[PDB]
Design a protein around this ligand. Structure first.
Ligand SMILES: [Mg+2]
Ligand SMILES: [Mg+2]
Ligand SMILES: [Mg+2]
Ligand SMILES: [Mg+2]
Ligand SMILES: [Mg+2]
Ligand SMILES: [Mg+2]
Ligand SMILES: [Mg+2]
Ligand SMILES: [Mg+2]
Lengths: 282, 282, 282, 282, 282, 282
């Protein structure tokens, strides 16, 4: 009873922003307790070491059943330092990352770490001439809408909820750690949408979101002429804004059919389900 | 000089989700270092105490210049416990909250605390029959878009950047702490928008967002018949979706005039500014 | 039996613009006859007195079963004069007004008057620097769309049609007069919408429309600096435009379900009903 | 000083709905005084005679400088009876009508009557299976938006305002009565729009609005198979809804250029003008 | 058995652009073979004679079962020459045209020619000051969306598929050739739309499209003052852009009901049919 | 002097549909004469050989200055046959294709052929269960809007207008033939858009359009389970519909600035230019 976990956040990913809250949406679950720590947007090896140190430090008394590290590119220097420290700890760990994480997928399975790699969680257009705090927040709002309305966050919610159950049985083995890669095609194996065109619009939203990453990468790391890289990173943000609109359109189709899936948590932690607006969740 | 701060997050508010990130959007500032801790969505007295303890314990070796506590309703039991603990501590502190915080504005002033109260940061429709994880993320995506595109996040960015400069004097007087209340009318004193209709559409979005809170409160704490409260809380979410569309319309108007204000940070922390897309921030 | 009524219009309210027309949409009812008089937009004591005099003078030979006075703020000087004059007359009467009318609800009950107070029928941003004839017509077009597509006009239609039936008994008791207050929550007791999301979008539109009044009041009667009040009244109009877009969205949802409620009058005054587009009203 | 007029309304036209209010938008003009009378939607010869009788009756003491009759089809039996009674009276008169009014244009000039015929003020789809009170109000909201945002109402405002000046000079001759026909091409002789695409979108809105009339006529009077006439009249309403959207798009273009023309009345009655949002009207 | 046909394209009409491709959408039909020839946008007598000569020269060895000539105005000099030449040949022929072709309907029947006249296939705003290559492509994109999404292209597909079945039996008589005039009302008897509001929106789109022709004709052939004709032809294109939006709205309504009609060809030529997205065409 | 060219169309690409018409948009150019021939959508070797044979047979008497072959995938068997045949002839030739043509760029240069490869001209979702004639036309409408409004068609127009000037002097060498590959980045150096956000939205549209091809290819050639490939190809079409919306948004931004570039042909062939709506092209 009452599973515990520590979430570590370094750098920012739409999924890492929301991961812990997706598990206790109304703060009324009594089978879980969480702690969240991090160094904000900084994700260099020095800053990531400090963050895992905090986590490992509080774990001593908190005693988490599992620890989660979430942020961009698990293949980078900083995140790699975190996988190192978590794999060689006494707590099972899961790494939440984006597409670049695929580079170290096998390496993570070798380290005995779990993972949830979200391909559509795309890097933003991080050039100083374009990305100020407001633009970053706008992009994150659009990405958050895409990940939520397409149902990607439900896949994540379900992974952590199943792990939370395995954890209560005090039996968390490596074979229990999730090993997920989420993308457009993930929706084909789900029953998220009652309307077929809502699922197809959600798929198109996820494909565009995944494609945003290549554009941001080109503008931030490849293109060196500012007359070209500023328009390039901005075009990636215009793409995400349309992906958010497709996701919104999909959700509205479910509303027209009074079939919006909702899977809220009960106080005991069980995931309920409902489709009709006035239907009690069971 | 490198300013340091600790952010504590209990419960969720749109402003508390982004507050730290607004200060180092591309993680390239070399004049700041942050630590972020919290108990996720739980904000009861027990959890908030644990949250502030973590922070104060870390504060020992971290030695921050100030501490920020962000979350809903500064007047509630948990947040009140945090105010007392921080007011008692040796660290200058700021409280980020929503409109219910106005109830203790005089009290926080006597406690020697600074505050940033964001009226449009409205409580969501937290009824189990309606609010599942996906719906909560969708609402927050709309609220984030409203607070970003209307310019509210820039007001918050500026307040903390002003405090960070003060901290570089290793002397933050109570007089230096912010005492801000942000709402629709805050825009009248800013020069956020070059186009006046973009300003008034942004004002309309903040008014609608502020008004969402009362609908949410009614459906969550007053109405007891589920046949009435489920529609009531869903109507609050439809309002926030349209507020986000208004904020988007305001920003597209600035785009049509090639007048989108951007204020990115330079590596040394200086806040630059630009309006024209192809112009460098200076 | 042919029921007869006189409508008096002083000042302008969305509900007073349409009230009489809602009762005989195609002018084919043979069970009613109306006379409409007023002083246009002027609603001062002098004009309203003249307005009611015209009505009472016509009433002599016309012999109406009831008289209706519609216009903003039943509590203002002019409207109060009309209430006294009608309360004193021999004709059963109903007062159509907006939210400020709540201030004299007990008084109208003591005056033996009926009333229909429409909270979403909000005062417009009447400042010379902003409100010209075209802007006033645009605002009223949006308000009309909101009151029509959310179902508020059907509530008004039904109240008067019920009174007209009573009048066909040449005996309208004070007990027969309507005593209605319409707002967002009125929809919860109706079966206007087959789709629940159309109902909640309509509720959100009525909430926004109701909230417009406070912004208008602030910009017209409280704020004295033109640099602040012109933006304030324009923001109220942007809010009403989005309320109209929400009401339009609700109706398109009913169209997607081929469930648009239509309740036309038959030649003898009977109110028919239909939902499916190709179905005859019965 | 202080001109007086009586407006008579029988049947409904978007222009007749708004005609008098366009002359005193904030009810603060002190150079005019108006009286409005009518028989609501009924426009048969019996009802129109009664309406003009009311007007002529109150004219005795009110002493209007001119009388206005507004409603659909001045060529119909009812409206023809009104032109008869007004032409043979001692008060100059103006007839406001729609396109069918062109049939009796010369006949009206022979009667010494003035006129303003608005081609885009189209008859609605008045079939019982489709048009209930709510649908009628929705259609009128869309038409009101078209007539207002395209600038048609300004043409009307200007005609009556010029007549109001001639009237104060106590010299209202037939050569002073307006003789206007308004349509899409009317916009080419105006300076309404600063942005050329706003004028072209407004022209397209007026062309569609004018074309709606032929569709309504076919569905109401020609087509007799209900499986065909119900879809036909509804298609006319869908056309008007898009005309309203084009008009809205035009106004938004003026907003993007901060060039929305506003011509408000001063208390003395002079028509002021302004373009920039923060510009005082002169 | 393989049906053979030659298509001749002179000038451009939306239906002539697509006519042949609507018959073998994936190029996998094993029962047809076509040749397409033309003189691009030129449609004067010299060019049309050259186009038809090319077709008849090819016909000697190709041995087509029928020949189709498509392009604007069958009554113009160029197209009239094609009609004479085709009428003089041994090959069954069909003329695809626009509304102006109605003028020569009797001539074509006497010439033994079939015809499909598409009234909504409206002439564009062909004035040099407005119509450049890009604008000509944007208009055609909107017109193509209208003709496709309203179902007009399905009527054309059906007519030719019927002729192809007869061609296979070498049994195409003059009485088998189509004599079709397509417009808004054609939609009333199609089984195209499951949702009635989709049909009604599609009808509104075709009505607006048909009306665009009169505007283009006024701006290209009647009005001679450029300050007037440039805005006029531009307004025609704004109308067509809104007609495409209506057609898009109709299709989205069918998607909401998972009822989008699809009628693909099987490899053997059979026209299959389906409505539900996941249902195989049969 | 009159330039002559033959266009061969096999299979369908958005650019091949429009290529010839972009050169004489109003059919009033006195300096060009074209012949167009093809086998409709069929592009297998047998059909392509027949199309090219038709062209070369016509060429003997027509004496074209250059020949253009346009259609999907220059590397496929059919198109490869056209390349061989055209490379073997005396007539300067240009191949218009899509991204798959990049594979044979070296072959074409060795063949002495020019080429214009349009990467955003994406293959559609050609599965029988989804693509019927109507869906194929809707997709092409969206693709045409993208290629036109983003300015891609202006690049094609310019390339051919340059070749036409050389054709007039009978001076078309192999080095004069284009070698162009068009994509999102092509827009960075065009002087197409006055507003920078219009350029950025246009770039986002071309990026999404280019990405549609990979989705269509996955659903048509890789995925073999219908429960998966039908949703996949449908998602490609939803992407293209949003790319057209972005292109539409870019054009509306240019309209807001009265800066829509237009480059019409004069009767003598000269390419004129204008930006302001009421400015004559020069
Ligand atoms: Mg024959
Ligand atoms: Mg034969
Ligand atoms: Mg014959
Ligand atoms: Mg036969
Ligand atoms: Mg050669
Ligand atoms: Mg040669
Ligand atoms: Mg060679
Ligand atoms: Mg040369």
């Amino acid at each position: 009873t009452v599973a515990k976990a520590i979430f570590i956040k370094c750098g920012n990913l739409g999924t890492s922003m929301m991961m812990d809250m997706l598990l206790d949406e109304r703060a009324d679950r009594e089978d879980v307790e969480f702690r969240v720590v991090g160094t904000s947007v900084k994700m260099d090896p020095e800053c990531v070491e400090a963050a895992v140190e905090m986590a490992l430090d509080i774990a001593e008394d908190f005693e988490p059943d599992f620890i989660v590290y979430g942020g961009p590119n698990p293949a980078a220097p900083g995140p790699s330092k975190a996988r190192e420290m978590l794999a060689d700890s006494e707590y099972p760990a899961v790494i939440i990352g984006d597409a670049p994480g695929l580079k170290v997928k096998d390496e993570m399975e070798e380290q005995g770490l779990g993972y949830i790699l979200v391909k559509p969680d795309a890097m933003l257009g991080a050039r100083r001439e374009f990305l100020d705090p407001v633009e970053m927040a706008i992009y994150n709002a659009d990405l958050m809408k895409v990940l939520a309305a397409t149902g990607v966050f439900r896949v994540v919610q379900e992974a952590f909820d199943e792990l939370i159950e395995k954890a209560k049985e005090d039996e968390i083995s490596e074979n229990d750690l999730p090993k997920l890669v989420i993308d457009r095609n993930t929706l084909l194996e789900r029953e998220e949408f009652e309307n077929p065109y809502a699922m197809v619009k959600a798929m198109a939203a996820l494909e565009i979101a995944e494609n945003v990453a290549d554009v941001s990468v080109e503008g931030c790391f490849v293109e060196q002429d500012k007359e070209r890289y500023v328009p390039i990173v901005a075009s990636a943000h215009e793409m995400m804004r349309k992906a958010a609109e497709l996701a919104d359109e999909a959700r509205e189709l479910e509303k027209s059919n009074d079939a919006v899936l909702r899977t809220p948590h009960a106080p005991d932690g069980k995931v309920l389900s409902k489709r009709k607006f006035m239907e009690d969740p069971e």
